[PDB]
Amino acid sequence: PAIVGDEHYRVAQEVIRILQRYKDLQDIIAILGIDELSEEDKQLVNRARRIERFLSQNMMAAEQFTGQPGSTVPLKETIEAFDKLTKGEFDHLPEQAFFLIGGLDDLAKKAESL
Amino acid sequence: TAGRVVRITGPVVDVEFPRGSVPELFNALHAEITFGALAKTLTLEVAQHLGDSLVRCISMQPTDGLVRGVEVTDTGASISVPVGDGVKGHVFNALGDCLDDPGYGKDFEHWSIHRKPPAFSDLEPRTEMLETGLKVVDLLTPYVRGGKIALFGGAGVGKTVLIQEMINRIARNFGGTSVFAGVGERTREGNDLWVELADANVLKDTALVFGQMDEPPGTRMRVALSALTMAEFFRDEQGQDVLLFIDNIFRFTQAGSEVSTLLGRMPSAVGYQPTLADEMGELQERITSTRGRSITSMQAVYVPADDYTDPAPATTFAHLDATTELSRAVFSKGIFPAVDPLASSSTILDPAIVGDEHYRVAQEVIRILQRYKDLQDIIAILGIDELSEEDKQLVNRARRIERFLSQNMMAAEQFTGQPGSTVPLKETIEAFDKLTKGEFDHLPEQAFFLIGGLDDLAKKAESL
Amino acid sequence: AADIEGAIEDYVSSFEEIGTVIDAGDGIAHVEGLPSVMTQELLEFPGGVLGVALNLDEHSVGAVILGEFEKIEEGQQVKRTGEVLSVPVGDAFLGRVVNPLGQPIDGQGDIAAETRRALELQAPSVVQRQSVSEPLQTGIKAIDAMTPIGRGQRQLIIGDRKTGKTAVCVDTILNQREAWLTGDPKQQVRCVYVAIGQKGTTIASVKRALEEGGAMEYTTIVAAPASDAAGFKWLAPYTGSAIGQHWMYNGKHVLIVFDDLSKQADAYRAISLLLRRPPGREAFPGDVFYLHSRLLERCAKLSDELGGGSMTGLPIIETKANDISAFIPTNVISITDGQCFLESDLFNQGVRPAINVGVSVSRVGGAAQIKAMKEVAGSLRLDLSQYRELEAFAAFASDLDAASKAQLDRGARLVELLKQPQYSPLAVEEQVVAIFLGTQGHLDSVPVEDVQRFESELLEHVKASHSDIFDGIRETKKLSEEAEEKLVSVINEFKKGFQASDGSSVV
Amino acid sequence: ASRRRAMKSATDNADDLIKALTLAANRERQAQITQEISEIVGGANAL
Ligand SMILES: Nc1ncnc2c1ncn2[C@@H]1O[C@H](COP(=O)(O)OP(=O)(O)OP(=O)(O)O)[C@@H](O)[C@H]1O
Ligand SMILES: Nc1ncnc2c1ncn2[C@@H]1O[C@H](COP(=O)(O)OP(=O)(O)OP(=O)(O)O)[C@@H](O)[C@H]1O
Ligand SMILES: [Mg+2]
Ligand SMILES: [Mg+2]
Numbered sequence A: 001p002a003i004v005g006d007e008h009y010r011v012a013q014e015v016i017r018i019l020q021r022y023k024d025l026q027d028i029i030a031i032l033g034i035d036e037l038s039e040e041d042k043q044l045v046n047r048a049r050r051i052e053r054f055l056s057q058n059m060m061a062a063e064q065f066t067g068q069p070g071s072t073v074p075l076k077e078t079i080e081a082f083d084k085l086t087k088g089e090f091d092h093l094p095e096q097a098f099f100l101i102g103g104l105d106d107l108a109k110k111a112e113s114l
Numbered sequence B: 001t002a003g004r005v006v007r008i009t010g011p012v013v014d015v016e017f018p019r020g021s022v023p024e025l026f027n028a029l030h031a032e033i034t035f036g037a038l039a040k041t042l043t044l045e046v047a048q049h050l051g052d053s054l055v056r057c058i059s060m061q062p063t064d065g066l067v068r069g070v071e072v073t074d075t076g077a078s079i080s081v082p083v084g085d086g087v088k089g090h091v092f093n094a095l096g097d098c099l100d101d102p103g104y105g106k107d108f109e110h111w112s113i114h115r116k117p118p119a120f121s122d123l124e125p126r127t128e129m130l131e132t133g134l135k136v137v138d139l140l141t142p143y144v145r146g147g148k149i150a151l152f153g154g155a156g157v158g159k160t161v162l163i164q165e166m167i168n169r170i171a172r173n174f175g176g177t178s179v180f181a182g183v184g185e186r187t188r189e190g191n192d193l194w195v196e197l198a199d200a201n202v203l204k205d206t207a208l209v210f211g212q213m214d215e216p217p218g219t220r221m222r223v224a225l226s227a228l229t230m231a232e233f234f235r236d237e238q239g240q241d242v243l244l245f246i247d248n249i250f251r252f253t254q255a256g257s258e259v260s261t262l263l264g265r266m267p268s269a270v271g272y273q274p275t276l277a278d279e280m281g282e283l284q285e286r287i288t289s290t291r292g293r294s295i296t297s298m299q300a301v302y303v304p305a306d307d308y309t310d311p312a313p314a315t316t317f318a319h320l321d322a323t324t325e326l327s328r329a330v331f332s333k334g335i336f337p338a339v340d341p342l343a344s345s346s347t348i349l350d351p352a353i354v355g356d357e358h359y360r361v362a363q364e365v366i367r368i369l370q371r372y373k374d375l376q377d378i379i380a381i382l383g384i385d386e387l388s389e390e391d392k393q394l395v396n397r398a399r400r401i402e403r404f405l406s407q408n409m410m411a412a413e414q415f416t417g418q419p420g421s422t423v424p425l426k427e428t429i430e431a432f433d434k435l436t437k438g439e440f441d442h443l444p445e446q447a448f449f450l451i452g453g454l455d456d457l458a459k460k461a462e463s464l
Numbered sequence C: 001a002a003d004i005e006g007a008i009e010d011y012v013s014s015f016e017e018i019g020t021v022i023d024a025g026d027g028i029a030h031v032e033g034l035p036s037v038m039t040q041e042l043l044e045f046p047g048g049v050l051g052v053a054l055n056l057d058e059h060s061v062g063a064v065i066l067g068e069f070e071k072i073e074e075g076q077q078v079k080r081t082g083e084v085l086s087v088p089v090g091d092a093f094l095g096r097v098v099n100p101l102g103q104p105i106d107g108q109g110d111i112a113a114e115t116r117r118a119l120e121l122q123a124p125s126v127v128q129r130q131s132v133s134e135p136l137q138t139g140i141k142a143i144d145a146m147t148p149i150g151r152g153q154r155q156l157i158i159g160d161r162k163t164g165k166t167a168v169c170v171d172t173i174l175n176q177r178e179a180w181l182t183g184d185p186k187q188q189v190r191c192v193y194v195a196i197g198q199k200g201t202t203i204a205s206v207k208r209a210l211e212e213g214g215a216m217e218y219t220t221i222v223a224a225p226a227s228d229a230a231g232f233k234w235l236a237p238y239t240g241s242a243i244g245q246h247w248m249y250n251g252k253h254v255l256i257v258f259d260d261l262s263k264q265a266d267a268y269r270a271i272s273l274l275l276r277r278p279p280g281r282e283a284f285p286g287d288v289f290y291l292h293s294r295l296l297e298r299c300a301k302l303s304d305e306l307g308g309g310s311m312t313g314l315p316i317i318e319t320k321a322n323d324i325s326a327f328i329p330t331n332v333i334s335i336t337d338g339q340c341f342l343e344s345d346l347f348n349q350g351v352r353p354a355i356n357v358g359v360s361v362s363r364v365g366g367a368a369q370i371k372a373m374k375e376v377a378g379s380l381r382l383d384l385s386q387y388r389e390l391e392a393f394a395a396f397a398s399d400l401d402a403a404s405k406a407q408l409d410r411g412a413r414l415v416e417l418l419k420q421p422q423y424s425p426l427a428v429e430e431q432v433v434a435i436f437l438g439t440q441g442h443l444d445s446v447p448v449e450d451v452q453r454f455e456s457e458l459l460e461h462v463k464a465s466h467s468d469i470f471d472g473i474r475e476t477k478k479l480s481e482e483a484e485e486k487l488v489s490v491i492n493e494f495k496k497g498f499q500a501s502d503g504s505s506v507v
Numbered sequence D: 001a002s003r004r005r006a007m008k009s010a011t012d013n014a015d016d017l018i019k020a021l022t023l024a025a026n027r028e029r030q031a032q033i034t035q036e037i038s039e040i041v042g043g044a045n046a047l
Helices: A006-024 A026-031 A039-055 A060-066 A075-086 A104-113 B135-140 B159-169 B187-200 B217-236 B250-263 B276-283 B311-319 B328-332 B356-381 B389-404 B425-437 B454-463 C002-014 C141-146 C165-174 C200-212 C230-248 C261-274 C288-296 C327-335 C344-348 C371-394 C402-418 C428-439 C448-465 C468-476 C481-497 D002-044
Strands: B003-009 B012-016 B027-033 B040-051 B054-059 B071-078 B080-083 B091-093 B109-112 B148-153 B177-183 B206-211 B242-247 B295-302 B322-325 C018-025 C028-032 C041-044 C050-056 C060-066 C077-084 C086-089 C115-118 C156-159 C190-196 C219-224 C253-259 C310-318 C338-342
Touching: A006 A026, A006 A039, A006 A075, A026 B356, A039 A075, A075 A104, B003 B071, B012 B027, B012 B040, B012 B250, B040 B071, B040 B250, B054 B217, B054 B250, B080 B217, B091 B217, B109 B217, B135 B322, B135 B356, B135 B425, B148 B159, B148 B311, B159 B187, B159 B242, B159 B295, B177 B187, B177 B217, B187 B206, B206 B217, B217 B242, B217 B250, B217 B276, B217 B295, B250 B276, B250 B295, B250 B311, B276 B311, B295 B311, B356 B389, B356 B425, B356 D002, B389 B425, B425 B454, C018 C060, C050 C230, C060 C230, C086 C230, C115 C230, C141 C371, C141 C402, C141 C428, C156 C165, C156 C327, C165 C190, C165 C200, C165 C253, C165 C310, C165 C338, C190 C200, C190 C230, C190 C261, C200 C219, C219 C230, C230 C253, C230 C261, C230 C288, C230 C310, C261 C288, C261 C310, C261 C327, C288 C310, C288 C327, C310 C327, C338 C344, C371 C402, C371 C428, C402 C428, C402 C448, C428 C448, C428 C468, C428 C481, C448 C468, C448 C481, C468 C481
Parallel strands: B091 B206, B148 B295, B148 B322, B177 B206, B177 B242, B242 B295, C156 C310, C156 C338, C190 C219, C190 C253, C253 C310
Antiparallel strands: B003 B012, B003 C050, B012 B054, B027 B040, B027 B071, B040 B054, B080 B109, C018 C028, C018 C077, C028 C060, C041 C050, C041 C077, C050 C060, C086 C115
16 A cells, blocks of 8 residues: 555455455355355355456457457556446446456447447 | 396396307296295296396296206297197186196297287278177277277276176177186186186187286286287187287286386386386287288276376277276266266267267267266255256256166176176167157166166066 | 306305395395395394395395394394295194294294295186185175175275274184084184284284184184284285195185285385385385285185185275275275275264175175075165165155155164174074065064164074074075975064063064 | 255265365375375485
């Protein structure tokens, strides 16, 4: 918090919390089922999947992998994107809207495409 | 002239010869143990040249009572075994010496047990199926006439029972000749096989070679080559169709590992000899069938610690056209012959060879069993009840397919008391096609245990 | 130069002779000299300790010391015994406890051994054997019913620590008293109980049990307790095998228990690692299978040309946490002709002996089981295999078919029927009747908890009142229809007067 | 009631699976230690 900020640190630590919880719920989901989870855990699992897919990015030097051009997400835009995600602002968008998409504007474009 | 024993390290003997009379590799040397209780004409085989005219040799009889300094005479030729129609119907040890009557075969033609495998020009692939009458083999692991076949398994899964079963199916009505190689197996099972073949009258058409457990690693690793020499004689010279059963071929590599550790060679991954691949290939590349003369081979492979990643099975997998991997989990269910339908494979299960009716049914069965294996986790924790309806139906028929692959084998008569049954390939294809389509999902699952056929399946379904 | 070679030869030929120790530690000694020593010769060191000359190098002789290697030191004189590795053998060994070198350790006098026998003699060949034909009545209902042992068979008792293995073996040894008292060598069984790595107290208790049951008139103990170095724990099984083989080749029937071959494997691992032989799987040398197979393979049923003797092996393997797939257990299974897997889970629940049906099997049995016992026990193994699956199924199923409940109630009585107390072997005459009680449903009318009594009290009653059944089973070896009708009559008569613990009428 | 029974069965099966997997993990751990020791001492015994 003393170096990167206190909003950056909070967003990153909440993302880590969500992902760790969804790595402990993955086995239950795979064997028991997502319905058997609590409501909070279910909504957290949705957030976690969207966060995992949003951490992916179409990198510039990997246009031979994906075809589409690269993208740069400014730090401030990233930390707000993930603050929104951890708070459920994007819980309604489909998972694929967050896959290999570089930022909030591109997220909206892909959500409208889907 | 004769040499002198210098070093004795278990079954390995170092012998120093004069300056120029050092023997060739694989030459047969003779020493004498004179201690009264166990005196014998020890046979050694030259394995290495260590310099200063020293040669390190592998003993064939146990090296007990042997004294440093005893004269060693080199025969000038490798270990020789008798060959001819005469060897049929008799029991030989690794050195060609007959057992049921020790005076036999010392005048027959003698062949060296060490030879290079047939030239690559003479090899051609074998793609003719060998109906064994077993549903699991005939469906998912169709054996190859004239091709190498393997029965992999740990301790107690049924390898030997399967070998004698296929002696019943194949050898008992075989037109040509058979050879059996007891490598590192029980002398009890050797004697049992001898009496069984004598009773079935198959003995006259088979030559038995035994290198059983109680013998030192030398014979326990040269017995395979000793039997393979007779098989190769019946192949190349007589032109007869040959069967070659070998139980167990892992003991050859195990004796190789023992002799390797004794010879001073550095150990490989898990303690096996560094030349595991080389020796294993030298053996099993002579078991091949050439263009105009076939040598069908069936080899029981022991898988230590039930570890299928062990270097010995891992190496011997590459030398096979059909592999029948017996598994402990199937054995515990009582599903005999105990084959793992998924881990087993055959090189002739392609539709160009077995036909598309056979291939499609086999692939559907494998798909059902693979889905069952994938769901095994949920089955273990929660049970069948919590699956999807599609997967629930798939599992309910997967269990029935798995049990129907079991068969009351002929060799099983001594254990179960039931008589054995043979299912023709067409009936197996039709039955498993019906099973995969769900035409038998109503019958109880136990109606499939050890049943061997559609008609007998209906009989047992009526019984329950 | 060549005159040189020649006089060198003079010297080599020139080659009551004494060696000297030049290296010693942890059970391995090296002896310079002894140019005429045989490989695996038995060398003698001054303190009375003996070694086995395994390695015969150009410079020295590497000998494994059997016993107190702490007494060995550099410069000691080593003497040839002139004998390849061998143990004294004879009929004088009966009733005697002897260390792996045949030296008595029971405190009695010396042993008047007939001769010596080399521990490393070849086992009978393929043509010198014959299929086992007569049973080795263990006295244990479970073994004699579901996994019978025939004379000349290698049966592997296998299970976790404290699972009833030595109990089964001691019961087997005790049950041979009725055969010994006959005096007929074609029916007598002489026992040899090789204790490898066991506590001294355990061996003392085994000897006590054998003495109380009269088994020491014909049983020899080869004791290599945990105290003794790896040498004794290594060659104790071979000493037992030699003692047994001497009788086997004289036309006599032998029963060799090896308790435990897992501890011999560990001892051989220690010896081979001290010799610096590169380890293999589980740190064992590549020839541990050779050790155990060379051993157990000598247990054979000789052909009538060689006297028709037999030696029945009952190796004990102490698995770890029911790891029957481990290296040594799998090796011994691949060596032996069957396994009796004493499960610990059953052992804690009072199922005693804890024989796990299904996994437990006697490959060579059936041909070595008396007619009546085979008749009664044919359905027993399948019934218990089904039950023990139905038992688990029922605990969670809401309800079951009346037929399934009948099978459950039959199995719950069969299991109690096979339950048996320690040191109480049953003659096959009583085993067949006991299994007849349950397999034919006569126990259905008896509550489960009382079955054990209803069995025993009946066996005594018959033994006191209707011994004709037992005598018929002895002489004819089949439960004839006349005898079966008499037996059911006696069963019904007993039932009327048999009390239950709850007082219910079992009629 | 059926849920209680099924969950008790699932808990028992999970406990048995944990025990079996713990035994397997211990066997693999010992095997890896032995293999590492074998490699190390094979390298020493060569040098
Ligand atoms: N089809 C069968 N029906 C009944 N019992 C069977 C059957 N197959 C195997 N068994 C039982 O399992 C034992 C397995 O014997 P087998 O020697 O074939 O097994 P293996 O462990 O693969 O071989 P080996 O010990 O020779 O390496 C049989 O002796 C018998 O006890
Ligand atoms: N059939 C039996 N009925 C009752 N108690 C028994 C029975 N078999 C063994 N026991 C008891 O169980 C305990 C252990 O038995 P036992 O000595 O046979 O075990 P084990 O498997 O040989 O163990 P160890 O590792 O000590 O050799 C002892 O108290 C013994 O009295
Ligand atoms: Mg076998
Ligand atoms: Mg014990």
